[PDB]
Design a protein around this ligand. Structure first.
Ligand SMILES: [Fe+2]
Ligand SMILES: [Fe+2]
Length: 174
């Protein structure tokens, strides 16, 4: 009946998995088949994609410092996750997590998405700030459902082309 096992020390765990909180893996999911998706995310890792989560995301930056490039009231704001910070992101707020420090570790909690509720991933033009490409996905496994999504964007000039100013988006690296 204790489906997810008994209580364990969190720092030690983080230490035991330090080799997975670094590229290319970069994050690790604490429990499997749970309704709460509990993830530790490591560094370093930058990315150009923005996430459109239809549910809330909870952050607690345990070690080191990160930041979330945001889109808030139509402007490109930025949330700082200094060490020891917690943050609660409301549904659908577009966010792009940047984690430059090696050895950093941030607790990110989310919930499973019920059938029909779709996550969006989308990129924006560094020139005019328009929307360049959005992909909606039914998230089940974050490792089998998500790398291919980005890889197909990187590998297509068409998808990356701003439909407004014509500028082609850089792709993997800003
Ligand atoms: Fe997210
Ligand atoms: Fe553009």
């Amino acid at each position: 009946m204790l489906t997810y096992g008994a209580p364990f020390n969190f720092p030690r765990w983080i230490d035991e998995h330090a080799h997975l909180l670094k590229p290319p893996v970069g994050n690790r999911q604490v429990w499997q088949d749970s309704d709460f998706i509990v993830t530790v995310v490591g560094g370093p890792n930058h990315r150009t994609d923005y996430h459109d989560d239809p549910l809330e995301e909870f952050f607690y930056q345990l070690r080191g410092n990160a930041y979330l490039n945001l889109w808030v009231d139509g402007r490109r704001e930025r949330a700082d996750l200094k060490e020891g910070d917690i943050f609660l992101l409301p549904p659908h707020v577009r966010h792009s997590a940047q984690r430059p420090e090696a050895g950093s570790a941030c607790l990110v909690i989310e919930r499973q998405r019920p059938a029909g509720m779709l996550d969006g991933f989308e990129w924006y033009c560094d020139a005019c700030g328009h929307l360049v490409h959005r992909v909606e996905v039914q998230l089940k496994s974050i490792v089998t459902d998500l790398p291919p999504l980005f890889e197909s964007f990187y590998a297509s000039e068409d998808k990356r082309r701003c439909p407004h100013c014509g500028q082609v988006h850089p792709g993997r690296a800003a």
